[PDB]
Amino acid sequence: LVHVASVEKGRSYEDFQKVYNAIALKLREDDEYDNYIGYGPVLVRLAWHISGTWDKHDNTGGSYGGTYRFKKEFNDPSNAGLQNGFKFLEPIHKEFPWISSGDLFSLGGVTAVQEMQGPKIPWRCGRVDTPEDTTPDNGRLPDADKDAGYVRTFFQRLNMNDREVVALMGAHALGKTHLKNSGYEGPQGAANNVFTNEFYLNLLNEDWKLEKNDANNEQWDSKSGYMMLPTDYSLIQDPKYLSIVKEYANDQDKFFKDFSKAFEKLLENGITFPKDAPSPFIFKTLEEQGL
Ligand code: HEM
Numbered sequence: 001l002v003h004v005a006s007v008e009k010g011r012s013y014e015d016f017q018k019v020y021n022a023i024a025l026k027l028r029e030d031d032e033y034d035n036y037i038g039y040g041p042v043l044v045r046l047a048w049h050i051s052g053t054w055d056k057h058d059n060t061g062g063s064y065g066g067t068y069r070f071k072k073e074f075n076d077p078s079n080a081g082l083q084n085g086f087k088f089l090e091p092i093h094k095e096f097p098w099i100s101s102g103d104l105f106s107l108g109g110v111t112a113v114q115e116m117q118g119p120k121i122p123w124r125c126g127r128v129d130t131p132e133d134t135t136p137d138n139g140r141l142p143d144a145d146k147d148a149g150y151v152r153t154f155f156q157r158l159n160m161n162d163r164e165v166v167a168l169m170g171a172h173a174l175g176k177t178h179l180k181n182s183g184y185e186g187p188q189g190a191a192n193n194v195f196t197n198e199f200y201l202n203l204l205n206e207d208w209k210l211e212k213n214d215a216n217n218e219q220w221d222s223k224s225g226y227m228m229l230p231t232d233y234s235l236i237q238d239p240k241y242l243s244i245v246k247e248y249a250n251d252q253d254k255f256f257k258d259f260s261k262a263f264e265k266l267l268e269n270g271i272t273f274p275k276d277a278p279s280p281f282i283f284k285t286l287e288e289q290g291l
Protein backbone atom coordinates (compact mmCIF):
# COMPACT_ATOMS: atom_id res chain seq x y z
CA LEU A 1 0.00 0.00 0.00
CA VAL A 2 1.31 3.41 -0.93
CA HIS A 3 -0.60 6.49 -0.17
CA VAL A 4 0.68 9.44 -1.97
CA ALA A 5 -0.36 12.77 -0.74
CA SER A 6 -2.33 14.67 -3.25
CA VAL A 7 -3.05 18.36 -2.87
CA GLU A 8 -6.69 19.18 -3.13
CA LYS A 9 -6.93 20.64 -6.59
CA GLY A 10 -6.00 24.30 -6.69
CA ARG A 11 -5.82 25.02 -3.04
CA SER A 12 -2.94 26.82 -1.37
CA TYR A 13 -1.88 27.86 2.13
CA GLU A 14 -4.39 30.66 2.31
CA ASP A 15 -7.16 28.21 1.73
CA PHE A 16 -6.09 26.11 4.63
CA GLN A 17 -5.57 29.04 6.91
CA LYS A 18 -9.29 29.68 6.49
CA VAL A 19 -10.36 26.21 7.46
CA TYR A 20 -8.12 26.75 10.48
CA ASN A 21 -9.63 30.00 11.41
CA ALA A 22 -13.03 28.51 11.00
CA ILE A 23 -12.24 25.77 13.45
CA ALA A 24 -10.64 28.18 15.78
CA LEU A 25 -13.49 30.61 15.84
CA LYS A 26 -15.82 27.82 16.50
CA LEU A 27 -13.72 26.61 19.41
CA ARG A 28 -13.97 29.98 20.91
CA GLU A 29 -17.72 30.02 20.49
CA ASP A 30 -18.81 26.62 21.74
CA ASP A 31 -17.09 26.88 25.04
CA GLU A 32 -19.72 25.21 27.20
CA TYR A 33 -18.95 21.71 26.06
CA ASP A 34 -18.12 19.11 28.73
CA ASN A 35 -18.76 21.69 31.41
CA TYR A 36 -16.65 24.46 30.09
CA ILE A 37 -13.63 22.44 28.94
CA GLY A 38 -14.50 23.26 25.35
CA TYR A 39 -13.93 21.04 22.31
CA GLY A 40 -10.16 21.44 22.19
CA PRO A 41 -9.45 18.22 23.95
CA VAL A 42 -11.82 15.99 22.11
CA LEU A 43 -10.37 17.25 18.77
CA VAL A 44 -6.83 16.38 19.74
CA ARG A 45 -8.04 12.93 20.64
CA LEU A 46 -9.97 12.60 17.36
CA ALA A 47 -6.88 13.52 15.43
CA TRP A 48 -4.80 11.02 17.38
CA HIS A 49 -7.36 8.28 17.05
CA ILE A 50 -7.82 8.50 13.27
CA SER A 51 -4.08 8.20 13.05
CA GLY A 52 -3.36 5.48 15.63
CA THR A 53 -4.91 2.73 13.63
CA TRP A 54 -1.79 2.66 11.52
CA ASP A 55 0.29 -0.46 11.00
CA LYS A 56 3.97 0.02 9.93
CA HIS A 57 3.95 -3.54 8.85
CA ASP A 58 1.46 -3.35 6.01
CA ASN A 59 0.77 0.35 5.77
CA THR A 60 -2.96 -0.08 6.49
CA GLY A 61 -4.84 2.46 8.63
CA GLY A 62 -3.46 5.89 9.65
CA SER A 63 -5.05 9.26 8.80
CA TYR A 64 -4.78 9.30 5.01
CA GLY A 65 -8.04 7.77 4.04
CA GLY A 66 -10.42 9.53 6.44
CA THR A 67 -11.93 6.14 7.29
CA TYR A 68 -13.29 7.39 10.58
CA ARG A 69 -16.23 8.57 8.60
CA PHE A 70 -17.33 4.97 7.97
CA LYS A 71 -19.43 2.94 10.43
CA LYS A 72 -16.89 0.15 11.35
CA GLU A 73 -14.40 2.86 12.53
CA PHE A 74 -16.86 5.32 13.77
CA ASN A 75 -18.56 2.78 16.00
CA ASP A 76 -15.28 1.46 17.40
CA PRO A 77 -15.61 1.13 21.17
CA SER A 78 -12.24 2.71 21.64
CA ASN A 79 -13.77 5.68 19.76
CA ALA A 80 -16.57 6.21 22.26
CA GLY A 81 -17.14 9.95 22.71
CA LEU A 82 -15.28 11.02 19.57
CA GLN A 83 -18.62 11.58 17.86
CA ASN A 84 -18.84 14.93 19.60
CA GLY A 85 -15.79 16.21 17.81
CA PHE A 86 -17.10 14.77 14.61
CA LYS A 87 -20.32 16.74 14.96
CA PHE A 88 -18.32 19.81 15.82
CA LEU A 89 -16.45 19.51 12.54
CA GLU A 90 -19.44 18.76 10.38
CA PRO A 91 -20.57 22.37 9.76
CA ILE A 92 -17.04 23.15 8.95
CA HIS A 93 -16.81 20.56 6.31
CA LYS A 94 -20.01 21.93 4.81
CA GLU A 95 -18.49 25.39 4.65
CA PHE A 96 -15.40 23.92 2.98
CA PRO A 97 -16.37 20.87 1.01
CA TRP A 98 -13.24 20.54 -1.05
CA ILE A 99 -11.15 19.48 1.97
CA SER A 100 -10.61 15.76 2.37
CA SER A 101 -11.74 14.13 5.59
CA GLY A 102 -8.30 13.03 6.69
CA ASP A 103 -7.15 16.55 6.12
CA LEU A 104 -9.93 18.03 8.25
CA PHE A 105 -9.79 15.54 11.16
CA SER A 106 -6.17 16.15 11.40
CA LEU A 107 -6.25 19.86 11.02
CA GLY A 108 -8.71 20.03 13.90
CA GLY A 109 -6.11 18.47 16.21
CA VAL A 110 -3.43 20.97 15.13
CA THR A 111 -5.81 23.85 15.52
CA ALA A 112 -6.83 22.61 18.90
CA VAL A 113 -3.30 22.38 20.16
CA GLN A 114 -2.27 25.75 18.88
CA GLU A 115 -5.41 27.55 20.00
CA MET A 116 -4.93 26.12 23.53
CA GLN A 117 -1.62 27.78 23.69
CA GLY A 118 0.45 24.74 22.78
CA PRO A 119 3.33 24.79 20.39
CA LYS A 120 3.01 25.34 16.65
CA ILE A 121 2.62 22.02 14.77
CA PRO A 122 3.62 22.07 11.09
CA TRP A 123 0.92 20.45 9.03
CA ARG A 124 0.77 18.94 5.57
CA CYS A 125 -2.30 18.66 3.24
CA GLY A 126 -2.82 15.84 0.72
CA ARG A 127 -4.71 13.05 2.43
CA VAL A 128 -7.12 11.30 0.17
CA ASP A 129 -10.40 9.83 1.05
CA THR A 130 -10.46 6.08 0.38
CA PRO A 131 -13.37 3.72 0.16
CA GLU A 132 -15.28 2.03 2.81
CA ASP A 133 -13.28 -1.15 2.46
CA THR A 134 -9.95 0.45 3.45
CA THR A 135 -11.42 0.96 6.94
CA PRO A 136 -9.17 -0.86 9.41
CA ASP A 137 -10.86 -3.27 11.68
CA ASN A 138 -11.55 -2.33 15.26
CA GLY A 139 -8.92 -3.36 17.73
CA ARG A 140 -5.88 -1.31 16.71
CA LEU A 141 -6.21 1.39 19.43
CA PRO A 142 -4.59 0.70 22.82
CA ASP A 143 -6.05 -0.49 26.06
CA ALA A 144 -5.57 1.58 29.23
CA ASP A 145 -5.19 -1.12 31.83
CA LYS A 146 -1.70 -2.11 30.92
CA ASP A 147 1.81 -1.29 31.84
CA ALA A 148 4.95 0.12 30.31
CA GLY A 149 5.82 -2.97 28.31
CA TYR A 150 2.46 -2.93 26.58
CA VAL A 151 2.73 0.77 25.80
CA ARG A 152 6.22 0.26 24.52
CA THR A 153 5.22 -2.60 22.36
CA PHE A 154 2.07 -0.88 21.22
CA PHE A 155 3.78 2.30 20.16
CA GLN A 156 6.38 0.48 18.22
CA ARG A 157 3.67 -0.43 15.77
CA LEU A 158 3.56 3.22 14.95
CA ASN A 159 7.29 3.73 14.82
CA MET A 160 7.47 5.73 17.90
CA ASN A 161 10.39 5.38 20.32
CA ASP A 162 10.47 6.11 24.08
CA ARG A 163 10.98 9.74 23.67
CA GLU A 164 7.99 10.22 21.29
CA VAL A 165 5.71 8.12 23.48
CA VAL A 166 6.39 10.16 26.49
CA ALA A 167 6.12 13.39 24.55
CA LEU A 168 2.92 12.22 23.07
CA MET A 169 1.37 11.25 26.37
CA GLY A 170 1.63 14.79 27.77
CA ALA A 171 -1.50 15.48 25.78
CA HIS A 172 -3.24 13.69 28.66
CA ALA A 173 -2.99 16.90 30.54
CA LEU A 174 -5.96 17.99 28.45
CA GLY A 175 -9.59 17.03 28.91
CA LYS A 176 -10.41 14.14 31.11
CA THR A 177 -11.66 10.59 31.25
CA HIS A 178 -15.38 10.00 31.18
CA LEU A 179 -17.00 7.05 32.83
CA LYS A 180 -19.56 6.50 30.16
CA ASN A 181 -16.88 6.56 27.47
CA SER A 182 -14.03 4.40 28.59
CA GLY A 183 -14.98 3.21 31.99
CA TYR A 184 -12.58 5.79 33.67
CA GLU A 185 -13.39 9.00 35.36
CA GLY A 186 -11.65 12.27 36.17
CA PRO A 187 -9.23 14.96 34.95
CA GLN A 188 -5.44 14.75 35.10
CA GLY A 189 -4.84 18.13 36.53
CA ALA A 190 -6.24 21.57 36.82
CA ALA A 191 -5.43 23.39 33.57
CA ASN A 192 -7.37 21.14 31.35
CA ASN A 193 -7.85 23.31 28.33
CA VAL A 194 -4.61 25.13 28.09
CA PHE A 195 -1.60 23.14 26.87
CA THR A 196 1.25 22.82 29.40
CA ASN A 197 3.63 20.27 31.01
CA GLU A 198 1.18 19.76 33.87
CA PHE A 199 0.89 16.07 33.12
CA TYR A 200 4.49 15.31 34.08
CA LEU A 201 4.35 17.56 37.11
CA ASN A 202 1.28 15.79 38.38
CA LEU A 203 2.69 12.41 37.78
CA LEU A 204 5.77 13.29 39.73
CA ASN A 205 4.24 15.39 42.54
CA GLU A 206 0.93 13.98 43.61
CA ASP A 207 0.60 11.10 45.93
CA TRP A 208 -1.34 8.59 43.98
CA LYS A 209 -3.62 5.99 45.43
CA LEU A 210 -4.70 2.94 43.57
CA GLU A 211 -8.46 2.49 43.62
CA LYS A 212 -11.26 0.83 41.80
CA ASN A 213 -13.84 3.01 40.11
CA ASP A 214 -17.57 2.74 39.59
CA ALA A 215 -16.97 0.76 36.49
CA ASN A 216 -14.89 -1.70 38.43
CA ASN A 217 -11.64 -0.61 36.94
CA GLU A 218 -8.51 0.51 38.52
CA GLN A 219 -7.15 3.95 38.46
CA TRP A 220 -4.67 6.03 40.36
CA ASP A 221 -6.44 8.72 42.26
CA SER A 222 -4.88 11.67 43.93
CA LYS A 223 -6.02 13.86 46.84
CA SER A 224 -6.20 16.93 44.60
CA GLY A 225 -9.01 15.16 42.87
CA TYR A 226 -7.01 14.08 39.78
CA MET A 227 -6.71 10.60 38.25
CA MET A 228 -4.18 8.79 36.04
CA LEU A 229 -4.73 5.68 33.93
CA PRO A 230 -2.60 2.57 34.60
CA THR A 231 -0.94 3.39 31.29
CA ASP A 232 -0.31 6.93 32.44
CA TYR A 233 1.03 5.73 35.76
CA SER A 234 3.22 3.27 33.89
CA LEU A 235 5.49 6.23 32.77
CA ILE A 236 6.87 6.46 36.32
CA GLN A 237 7.22 2.76 36.78
CA ASP A 238 9.57 2.29 33.81
CA PRO A 239 13.10 3.59 34.29
CA LYS A 240 13.54 4.85 30.81
CA TYR A 241 10.17 6.58 30.70
CA LEU A 242 10.66 8.18 34.15
CA SER A 243 13.80 10.08 33.25
CA ILE A 244 11.96 11.52 30.24
CA VAL A 245 8.99 12.45 32.43
CA LYS A 246 11.47 14.18 34.65
CA GLU A 247 12.92 16.05 31.70
CA TYR A 248 9.53 17.38 30.63
CA ALA A 249 8.59 18.25 34.20
CA ASN A 250 11.54 20.56 34.24
CA ASP A 251 11.44 22.05 30.83
CA GLN A 252 8.19 22.84 29.16
CA ASP A 253 10.10 24.02 26.05
CA LYS A 254 11.79 20.71 25.47
CA PHE A 255 8.36 19.15 25.93
CA PHE A 256 6.80 21.43 23.38
CA LYS A 257 9.50 20.86 20.69
CA ASP A 258 9.30 17.16 21.23
CA PHE A 259 5.50 17.06 21.18
CA SER A 260 5.43 19.08 18.06
CA LYS A 261 7.71 16.75 16.11
CA ALA A 262 5.95 13.69 17.33
CA PHE A 263 2.47 14.83 16.75
CA GLU A 264 3.25 15.75 13.17
CA LYS A 265 4.94 12.41 12.68
CA LEU A 266 2.01 10.73 14.16
CA LEU A 267 -0.41 12.46 11.78
CA GLU A 268 1.85 11.81 8.83
CA ASN A 269 2.49 8.13 9.35
CA GLY A 270 1.70 6.04 6.28
CA ILE A 271 1.82 8.98 3.91
CA THR A 272 4.18 9.43 1.05
CA PHE A 273 4.89 13.07 0.29
CA PRO A 274 6.10 13.41 -3.28
CA LYS A 275 8.91 15.64 -4.24
CA ASP A 276 6.88 18.46 -5.54
CA ALA A 277 4.52 18.58 -2.52
CA PRO A 278 4.40 21.92 -0.84
CA SER A 279 6.26 22.32 2.36
CA PRO A 280 4.42 21.90 5.60
CA PHE A 281 2.38 24.82 6.61
CA ILE A 282 2.58 26.67 9.90
CA PHE A 283 -0.80 28.31 10.58
CA LYS A 284 -1.25 31.64 12.35
CA THR A 285 -3.35 31.47 15.42
CA LEU A 286 -6.45 33.66 15.65
CA GLU A 287 -4.57 35.94 17.91
CA GLU A 288 -1.65 36.21 15.63
CA GLN A 289 -3.98 37.42 13.06
CA GLY A 290 -5.84 39.79 15.37
CA LEU A 291 -9.26 37.91 14.89
C1 HEM B 1 -1.41 4.38 25.95
C2 HEM B 1 -1.92 5.22 25.06
C3 HEM B 1 -3.26 5.93 25.34
C4 HEM B 1 -4.27 5.47 26.04
C5 HEM B 1 -4.48 4.02 26.51
C6 HEM B 1 -5.27 6.51 26.07
C7 HEM B 1 -6.56 6.25 26.43
C8 HEM B 1 -7.22 7.39 26.81
C9 HEM B 1 -8.41 7.29 27.58
C10 HEM B 1 -8.99 5.94 28.04
C11 HEM B 1 -9.10 8.42 27.38
C12 HEM B 1 -10.43 8.88 28.02
C13 HEM B 1 -11.62 8.98 27.03
C14 HEM B 1 -12.96 9.36 27.63
O1 HEM B 1 -13.50 8.57 28.46
O2 HEM B 1 -13.57 10.32 27.10
C15 HEM B 1 -8.23 9.34 26.70
C16 HEM B 1 -8.52 10.68 26.84
C17 HEM B 1 -7.80 11.47 25.99
N1 HEM B 1 -6.74 11.02 25.23
FE1 HEM B 1 -5.66 9.35 25.38
N2 HEM B 1 -4.78 7.62 25.44
C18 HEM B 1 -3.49 7.32 25.08
C19 HEM B 1 -2.68 8.00 24.20
C20 HEM B 1 -3.02 9.29 23.94
C21 HEM B 1 -2.29 10.12 23.01
C22 HEM B 1 -1.04 9.67 22.22
C23 HEM B 1 -3.04 11.19 22.78
C24 HEM B 1 -2.71 12.39 21.88
C25 HEM B 1 -1.47 12.79 21.62
C26 HEM B 1 -4.05 11.22 23.82
C27 HEM B 1 -5.01 12.20 23.94
C28 HEM B 1 -6.15 12.15 24.69
C29 HEM B 1 -6.92 13.32 25.07
C30 HEM B 1 -6.54 14.78 24.77
C31 HEM B 1 -7.85 12.91 25.95
C32 HEM B 1 -8.92 13.74 26.66
C33 HEM B 1 -10.23 13.71 25.86
C34 HEM B 1 -11.40 14.47 26.40
O3 HEM B 1 -11.27 15.23 27.40
O4 HEM B 1 -12.47 14.14 25.84
N3 HEM B 1 -4.17 9.95 24.33
N4 HEM B 1 -7.00 8.72 26.48
Ligand SMILES: [K+]
Pocket residue numbers: 171172173174175176177187188
Ligand atom coordinates in the same frame (compact mmCIF):
# COMPACT_ATOMS: atom_id res chain seq x y z
K1 LIG C 1 -6.83 13.78 29.86
